[PDB]
Every structure is written in C-alpha cells, then in structure tokens.
Amino acid sequence: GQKRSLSREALQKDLDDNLFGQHLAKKIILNAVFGFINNPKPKKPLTLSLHGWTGTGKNFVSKIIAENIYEGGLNSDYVHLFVATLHFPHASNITLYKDQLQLWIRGNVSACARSIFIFDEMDKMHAGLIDAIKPFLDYYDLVDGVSYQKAMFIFLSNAGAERITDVALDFWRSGKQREDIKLKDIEHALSVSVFNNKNSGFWHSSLIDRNLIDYFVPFLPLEYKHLKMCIRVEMQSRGYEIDEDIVSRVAEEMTFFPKEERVFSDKGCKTVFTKLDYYYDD
Amino acid sequence: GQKRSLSREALQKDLDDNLFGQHLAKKIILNAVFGFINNPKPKKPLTLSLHGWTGTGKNFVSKIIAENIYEGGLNSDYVHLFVATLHFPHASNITLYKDQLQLWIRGNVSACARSIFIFDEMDKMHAGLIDAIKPFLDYYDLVDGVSYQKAMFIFLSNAGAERITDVALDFWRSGKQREDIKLKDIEHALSVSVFNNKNSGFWHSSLIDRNLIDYFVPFLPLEYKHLKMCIRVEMQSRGYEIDEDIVSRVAEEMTFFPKEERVFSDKGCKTVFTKLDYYYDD
Amino acid sequence: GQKRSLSREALQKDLDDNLFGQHLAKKIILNAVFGFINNPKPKKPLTLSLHGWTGTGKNFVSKIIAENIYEGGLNSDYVHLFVATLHFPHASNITLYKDQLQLWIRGNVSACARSIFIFDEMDKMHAGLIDAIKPFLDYYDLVDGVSYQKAMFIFLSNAGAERITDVALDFWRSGKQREDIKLKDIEHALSVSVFNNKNSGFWHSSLIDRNLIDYFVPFLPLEYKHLKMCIRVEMQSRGYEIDEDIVSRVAEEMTFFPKEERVFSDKGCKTVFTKLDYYYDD
Amino acid sequence: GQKRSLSREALQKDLDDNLFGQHLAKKIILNAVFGFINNPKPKKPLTLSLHGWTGTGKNFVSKIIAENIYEGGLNSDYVHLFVATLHFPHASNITLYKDQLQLWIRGNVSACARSIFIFDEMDKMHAGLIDAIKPFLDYYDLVDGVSYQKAMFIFLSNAGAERITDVALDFWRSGKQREDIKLKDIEHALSVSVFNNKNSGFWHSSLIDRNLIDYFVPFLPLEYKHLKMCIRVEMQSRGYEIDEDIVSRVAEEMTFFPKEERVFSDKGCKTVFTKLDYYYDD
Ligand SMILES: Nc1ncnc2c1ncn2[C@@H]1O[C@H](COP(=O)(O)OP(=O)(O)OP(=O)(O)O)[C@@H](O)[C@H]1O
Ligand SMILES: Nc1ncnc2c1ncn2[C@@H]1O[C@H](COP(=O)(O)OP(=O)(O)OP(=O)(O)O)[C@@H](O)[C@H]1O
Ligand SMILES: Nc1ncnc2c1ncn2[C@@H]1O[C@H](COP(=O)(O)OP(=O)(O)OP(=O)(O)O)[C@@H](O)[C@H]1O
Ligand SMILES: Nc1ncnc2c1ncn2[C@@H]1O[C@H](COP(=O)(O)OP(=O)(O)OP(=O)(O)O)[C@@H](O)[C@H]1O
C-alpha cells in the first residue's frame, strides 16, 4: 500500500464496492488523484474542498483513500490530523495556534512530502489561521529549502448545502436523477457561499483570494435507495439476519426532506445501522 | 462482572426483578447494549439521551447497569462522574471547564475505552461545554491516536416532560395503558424540546446538529400501581411488617396529577418509603 | 561443549525440548548461529537485538545457548557479563565507564575471540557509552592488532513492545495464530522505536546509524497455552503431583490482556510456578 | 535451628500457638516457605510484600520465623537489618546509600546465601534506591559470580489499608467472618495501591514493573476477640492474675472502628498489655 502508487483499478474498485451513488465523487477523485499521484511534478500540493450534507461519506472517503495510500490509514505517523475545536478553540491564542501549526507542518512534511493533512469543523475558525498557510500553497518549488507540492491538503465543511439542496430538487423536479445532473453546477453560487463573509465562508473567501483550491466537490443527501443499500449491504455483511419487513421500515419509520415529498434523507448511512438495531428490536 | 460481557438473561432478569413498568426501557436498554457491548466494532460510542419525569429510575437504572458491568458500580475508577453545578457552576470559567473536561476524559479513557461517563442536571449548562466534545463523538476510529467508540456517554434531564404527559393522558384517555402505547411516539416534538432554544433544549439543539444521540428515551410517571409495587416489594423486602391499610393509605393520603382525575404520581418510588415510614407512624 | 562447534541438531533439539512456541526464534537463532559459528570468516561479530515482552525467555534463551557453547554457561571466564545499573548507574562517571568498558573488553577478548558479552536493562544508558564501541563493530579484520569479528554481542530491552502487541491482536483478530504470522513484520516501525529519540530508542538510534545490528528479534506474550505447557511440563518435571483442576486454575485465577478478551498473558512462564505453588495450596 | 530445615509441623505449631487469627498468613507462610526452603533450586530469592494495618504482627511474625530459622533471630550476623529513616533519611545522599547498600548486601550474602534482609518504614524511600536492586531479583543463577536466589527479601508498609478495611466491612456486612473471606481478594486494587504514584506506591510501582514480588499479603485489624486472646493468653502467661472484669474492660474502655459499629480495633495486641496494666490499676 504505502509502497504502491495507486492504480486506477484499485480505487474505482474500492469505491464501486463500498461507495453508494456519488458518481461525481468517483469520477473526480479517481481521475484527479490518479493523475496527481502518478505525476512526479504536480507543481502544487492538492488543495481539495468539501462541503454539503453529512453522512454522505466525507470522513468516510477520506478514511478510505487514507487506507489505500498507507496501511496506517489514520494511524500513520505521516498522516497527522488537526481539528478546529480540539486544538484551536479560541480567538485568544491565535498566534500560538499559527506558530504551532507551521512547526507541526514542517515536522511531518520534513519526514516526507507524501504526508497528508486534513482539517474538520471549519465553521469555527479565524482568518489569521489561513494567513499562515497561503505561502505554503504557492506553486513555488520550495519554501525554506523545502518543497511541499507533493503533499495534499483537504478541507471539510457543510456550508453552501442550501444550493446543492434546491438544485437537487430543481433537476429532480424536472423528472430526473442526479446521475443526469452533471458535475458542472452553479459554481458561481458556490463562490458566493465561499465568498460568504460569514466566518465559515469568509475563511474560504480569503483562501479563494487566488483559487488556491483545486476542485469544489459537494456531496448530496444519500437517497433512500442509498439507505436500502447501506441496510442490505451492511446487515448482510454483519450476519445480522435482516429480511424484507426491516426494509419496509426504512421508510415506514423515518423522516425525509421536505415533508411535502418525503425524499431527501436526514442522515443517509450514518444513523442507519442504529435504527436497524431497532428493527432487530422491531 | 467486570470480566463478564453482559448476557441478555442477566439484564432482563435484573430489570424484571426490580424495575417496575417501563417496558420500553427494558426493550431499548436490553437489546441496545446487548448488541453494543457484544459488538467489537461499535463504530461510535454510545450516545444515550434521557429526559422526562423523576423518580422513574434514571439514576436508578444507570446505577443498576453500572453495577452489572463493574462491581464498582459508581465506585469504579473507570466510572468517573461529572455534574453541572458541583463542577461547572458559572459561565465565567467555561474555558477551564472545557480544558479540565478534555483532560479528565483522556485520562479515564486512556485507562480503558470501556470506562463510562454520565452527566446530570443538564438544565444548567453552556454550549461552549458541548463545543469541546462533538469531535469525540465523531465515528472516527480514533482521535489523537486514541479510540473512544467503545466508551458510553449518557445524559439526563427532565425537559420535554410536558409531551410525555399530555400524550400519556391522550392514549390513557383513549381507554388504554401505556403498555399499549408503543415506543414510537412523537419524536418530532421531542426534537422541538431538543431544538428548544432554551439553554436546556439549546444545548441538545447544538448536539442534535448531527443527531449524535443514539436513542431518545423518556420515562413516565410511575403509576399508583407502581407505588403499590415499591410499597409491597420494598416494605416486605425491609422486614417492615406492612399490611393492607398502609396500602390503602398510598392513595388515601397522596396527591396525584391532575386533580380532576388524580392519576399521575408526583414522585413514584422516590418519596414512597418516607411516607411509608409515616404509615408505620400511621 | 566448549570443544564442540554447535551442530544444528543439538540446538533445534534443545529449543524444541524446552522452548514453548517462538517458532521465529528457533528459525532465526538456529540457522543464524549455525551459519555464523561454522563460518571461520564471519567478517563481523554477531550484533543481536532483542526487545518486546518479558517472561518469553530472553535471559532464558541466552542462558541456554551459553550453556550449549560452554559448560560454564554464565560461569565461564570467557563469558563475562555487564549490566546497566549495577555497573553504570550515573551520567557522572560516563568516561570511567567507557574506559573500564574498553579495557575489560580487550581483556576477555584477548583471552579468546569466542568470548561472549551481553548487556541488560538498556533503558537506562547514555549514548557516550555506545560512542566507545562502534569501532569495535566495524567489519575491520582487526583493531589495535586484534580481531573481534568472532565474538558475539547481544542486547536486551522491552521497548517497542506496543507494536508487537497491536500487531499480535491484528493478525489474531484476523482469525489466525502467530505461527501464521511471518517473521517479516513492520521493521519500519521497529526502526521508529529504534529511532525513538527516547534514551532507550535513542541509544539504539545512534547504534542504528549504520545498522550495526544483524537481526531485530521480538518475542511475544507466552499465550495461555504456553502457561499450560510450562505448568504441565514443569510440575510433571518437578515431581509436583499436579492434576487437572490446577490447570483449570491457570485461567480461572489469572489476569490476561486485554480485559475485553483476556488473551495475552502478563508473565508467561515467569511467575507461573509460584502461582502453581498456590495451587498446591489450592 | 540454624542446622534445621524448617519442617511444616514446627511452623504451623508455632503460629497456631502464638498467632491469633490470620488464617491466611498461616496458609501462605507455611506452605510457601516450606516449599521454598526445602527447594534446593528456588530459581529466585523470596520476594515478599506486606502492607495493611499495624499490630497484627508483621514485625512479630518476621521475628518468629527469624527465630525458627536461626537461633540468633535478629541477633544473627547472617540476619542484617536496614531501615528507611535510620540509615536512608534524605534524598541528598541517595548514591552513597545505593553503593553502601550494594556492598553491605554482597558482604552478608557472600557470607551465606541463606542470609536474610528486611526493610521497614517504606513510605519514606526514593526510587533510585530500588534501581540498585532489581538486577539482584533477576532469576539469574548468578550475578558477579555469585548466586542470590536462596536469600529472602521481605518488605513492610501500611499503604493500601483502605482496601482491606472496606472489604472487611463488605463481607462482614454480608453476615460473615474473614475466615469465610478467601485469600483471593481484589489484587487489582492492590496493584493500584502498588501502582499508586505516591512515593509509597510508586516505589512498589517501579518494583512491580515485573512483579518481582512473589505474594501480596495483607494483614487485618485484630478483632476484639483477638484482643481478648492476647489478654487472656498474655496475662495468664505473665502471672498477672487477670480476672473477668478486666476483660469486660477490653471493650468497656477502648475505641474501635467505625464508631457507628465499634468493631475494628485501633491496635490489636500492640497497646493491649499497657492498657491491661491500667486494668491492674483498674
Ligand atoms: N455513501 C455511503 N455509502 C455507505 N455508507 C456511508 C456513505 N456515506 C456515509 N456512510 C456511513 O455513514 C457514516 C458517516 O460517514 P462520514 O462521517 O464520512 O460522513 P461525514 O460527511 O464525514 O459526516 P460529518 O460531515 O458530520 O463529518 C460512516 O460510518 C459511513 O460508513
Ligand atoms: N421504576 C421504579 N421501581 C422501583 N423503584 C424506583 C423506580 N424508579 C425510581 N425508584 C426509586 O426512586 C428513587 C429515585 O430514583 P432515581 O433517582 O433514579 O430517579 P431520577 O429520575 O434519577 O431522579 P432525578 O431525575 O431527580 O435524578 C430511587 O431510590 C429508586 O430506588
Ligand atoms: N518460552 C518459555 N518456555 C518455558 N519457560 C519460559 C519461557 N520463557 C520464559 N520462561 C521461564 O520464565 C522465566 C523468565 O525468563 P527470562 O528471564 O529469560 O525472560 P526475560 O525476557 O529475560 O525477562 P526480563 O525481560 O524481565 O529479563 C525463566 O525462569 C524461564 O524458565
Ligand atoms: N496476631 C497477634 N497475636 C498476638 N499478639 C500480637 C499479634 N499481632 C501483634 N501482636 C503483638 O503486638 C505487638 C506489635 O506487633 P508488630 O510490631 O509485629 O506489628 P507491626 O505490624 O510490625 O507494627 P508496625 O506495622 O507498626 O511495625 C507485638 O508486641 C506483638 O506481640
């Protein structure tokens, strides 16, 4: 794994095995990294953006590719993780947070440029804490006698969800499935959510000062078909002895969005197996 | 005990011995933990919610299962307890309360992931004090090189009682007992009480930002039958020499709710034995 | 013995008689020395490394081969032993410790190049005390008009145990025994423990500046089968009159690791016979 | 005596004559040494641990067996004694204390391996002063061309008393005597007191790094029956002319623990005879 440059087959295989729907994410991720990781000269690190609705698999997919790259998954000493609240709660110690940030970066990357960093809960940040990293995302071949363009920086959020929602019902109201929705959607309004001078969108506004991001990538509500997928596949994978009635109860005993149609889920495949344990309790 | 994974028989036995009514709680608890504790891969810690009326046995049942798991019950070094007021009175020292919180957590859990935490008196809290724990309730296999998904976090309150009351008289007014009331009841209005921007419900509103809770579980007023149960069973268990007249006085000398029906208790089995000591005084 | 070059049969015989499990150690040791001792031109002394969990037989196996080589075992004037604490407690007298070290070396080896040195308790050392011996582990045919490449230097520790543990439950969690685990395991993480700038791992970091070590060799927790082996074999060897119930009490009256599975021992065959004397006391 | 290997009869006889209660200690000691002293190959010295409450006979029993082994008792040149405070007061001269320790050891043991050492007042020690002796408690057949595995090292303390107390009232509250309490009791919590990073328990924490101890052995409060035993037996042994009223005054004129039950003694048979001299004064 760690001694394997990821071939396309392994990743399309993995996602097609476990990922439900999200054709966009398979296309994007597969071709994007498969070009990137095979490139000995990326010219830049990987600046990925994610937002939308939960339980669609953000930390899921990040975990998966983390496992395919390194056996450590998240256990790898290379793969070192940060969080907003656990590390960076307050606007008091912003400077310490910046210095500690820069140094912990230089440590892990100076171990190897193929190390990976991820952030999470980015609705609770303070733009000084981007002001210490934009130079690291210059396409410069180096900084301080070190190159960073092999590493890969990945973000997470949920803002801008309202656009992917009302668009989802837009085309779906057109007698259509999001398979037929294309990858291109209104990246202008995404730029607004990302220009949105709310601290969530203001953070990424000052980051998008130069589109240091590579690719905006929203996920979508795992439709009740996906519920049934992560009910059948999971409970049959767990020796759970599920049957049909339990999968009548996916929709007989769940709330979807909006009420007036009862379509878009509230969790997808996040709270699915707990409620399925109720359906063991039946 | 501590070297015993709890079999179903032991727990249904215990609850059927000592717990009066609360069929819902026996079903929920028994199957829920019995699936959870036997699961070597829970994918998440146990995020339990409780609210409703007192004296129905919240701290009672938590105590019981604490004893069945570990001989320490609450004496266990693993089982380390926090309280709102005793530890976290003021909105002044919120930050210290968060840091001390995180560290005391990491201590006990780093002793073992099967440690247990409980909170109480959650009507007196401040949402910063959830903002330090939501990452711990990611389904992440780890944080900071440590996994938390085996541990079990349990909360307590009494808000939202009005719904379980007016529903209780709803179906009971229908010529019916809450045995015939099903577990499913209006979890939407429960979400409102849990969305209720009152600090009690606002706390759990920002927690229910992702339904990090597993199962909402209300208790109900221990009906005067339950009084008579925890009068006969207790006083016969205590060598008290109770007789019939003392159990005429359970209702001849007590207030129930509402007045116009005199049905729902005020304490259930909490103040029962003190008033029974009056009936020794007769 | 001392006039015997160790044939393979004698050593595989001895280990297969007395050593329980540790297939890796039989393979490694047997072929390694059997090639080494029979080699009139080793090109280097034997640079052995050991770490892991106790009571698996480090000082046991070193004792055994010491006996097979020379009748003295440890009594041999050739076989002269050093210890961290007994000889080299403080960082004050480091220089005296280095000079005395070099001279005591030159004495014993100048008696014969087939002399043996062992160290122990290597978590309490100071890198100056390797800085006097790395030249002795050049593959040079000589130093100061003397050759050292026939002698054999052996170390001991317990650091890096966490890796052999979590790996042991890794493959064992895979429905598997460590017989099916191969000798190859993650020698990268072993290099980290051996790069671990802790003084224990920093010592061996500056030693592994050139991999002057030959073979990393961890031992593993002597599984409760091995307990029962060194209960039956020992007590039947001691005329102890053991029976079945005493070997019910190996697990009825012992702690294993983790609690949640009760698998990996705490001592293996170290404290076994004392507790068995309790089972005489029964 | 010194030319006598202790037969079982002599020791069970002696303890059954003079020792009051402490069935556990008779079983442990008798079988343990009787197997040990008769063993020509112990494989280790005797690593005994003692803690609990005073006046139950620690220095008493150590004295007794010291007398049975050698006529010198404590007068023997073989039996050479150390104390924390008298010899090892300060953390200033720790090194001198270690060197003097090692040398005085080597002296007495080189006189004979059947020499005995005891320590006392071990709540006032400094872990450097174990760091010089753990090698002596390797099961090695020798060190420095000398074997130590015949000698016997014995410790004393009073920490961890709280566990033997609250357990004593646990089973005693169960309608029961500690005769019916078994030898097995919560050796986990004993390990905590012995892991207790207090210097008293931290000392023995770094010793229990390898369970170099053989057997944990607590004593218990000599119950008022034992008072009356060491009142009748002693005063009748002393020609004191005791009568009944004096043994009404054992409890009419003494404090026990807790107040609310007045059960567990404060001294047992330590201050007993002085207060009995008051009852001569009556
Ligand atoms: N598309 C999917 N197919 C199958 N299972 C999924 C899918 N998406 C999510 N899950 C499951 O749901 C759970 C939640 O996934 P994950 O945490 O990655 O979503 P998320 O967007 O990271 O949530 P949040 O945004 O709150 O961090 C996981 O346990 C995962 O296995
Ligand atoms: N269902 C029941 N059957 C028998 N006894 C009960 C029951 N419920 C409560 N009791 C008794 O009533 C007392 C109160 O129980 P408990 O404190 O668990 O209720 P609670 O909901 O925790 O109260 P609060 O909400 O005020 O903390 C206990 O002493 C318990 O033994
Ligand atoms: N695999 C085994 N089979 C049988 N007996 C064993 C085995 N391993 C250890 N023992 C016994 O356990 C005791 C401890 O062995 P030994 O001291 O060699 O372990 P160790 O790793 O050297 O301990 P430490 O690391 O603390 O020095 C010895 O008396 C030995 O006979
Ligand atoms: N079980 C017993 N039966 C009869 N006499 C006893 C018993 N235990 C103690 N004594 C008497 O009480 C006195 C105190 O005994 P001893 O000093 O051995 O207790 P200790 O635990 O060593 O005290 P400390 O812990 O303070 O050193 C002695 O004089 C002894 O004779």
Residue numbers in the entry:
A (entry chain A), B (entry chain B), C (entry chain Q), D (entry chain O): 51 to 332
Task: List passages from the publication reporting this PDB structure.
Proteolytically cleaving MBP with 3C protease, combined with ATP-containing buffer resulted in longer filaments, which were then suitable for helical reconstruction. The resulting structure showed TorsinA to assemble into a helical filament with an outer diameter of ~14.5 nm. Surprisingly, and in contrast to most AAA + ATPases, we observe that the filament has a central channel with a diameter of ~4 nm. The filaments have a right-handed 1-start helix with a pitch of ~47 Å, and they contain 8.5 TorsinA molecules per turn with an axial rise of 5.5 Å per subunit. The superposition of filamentous TorsinA with its heterodimeric LULL1-bound state18 shows that the protein rearranges significantly. There, the rearrangement of residues 232–262, is critical to prevent steric clashes with the nucleotide bound to the neighboring unit. We presume that the TorsinA filaments are nucleotide bound for two reasons: first, we observed EM density at the nucleotide-binding site, and second, we observed robust filament formation only in ATP-containing buffer. We performed an NADH-coupled ATPase assay and observed no ATPase activity.
Torsins are essential proteins that belong to the AAA + (ATPases associated with a variety of cellular activities) superfamily. Torsins are restricted to multicellular eukaryotes and they exclusively reside in the endoplasmic reticulum (ER) and the connected perinuclear space (PNS). From a medical perspective TorsinA is important, since a deletion of glutamate 303 in TorsinA, TorsinAΔE for short, is the founding mutation for early-onset primary dystonia, a devastating and still incurable neuromuscular movement disorder. While LAP1 and LULL1 provide the Arg finger for activating ATP hydrolysis, they are unable to bind nucleotide themselves, due to a lack of the characteristic sequence motifs introduced above.
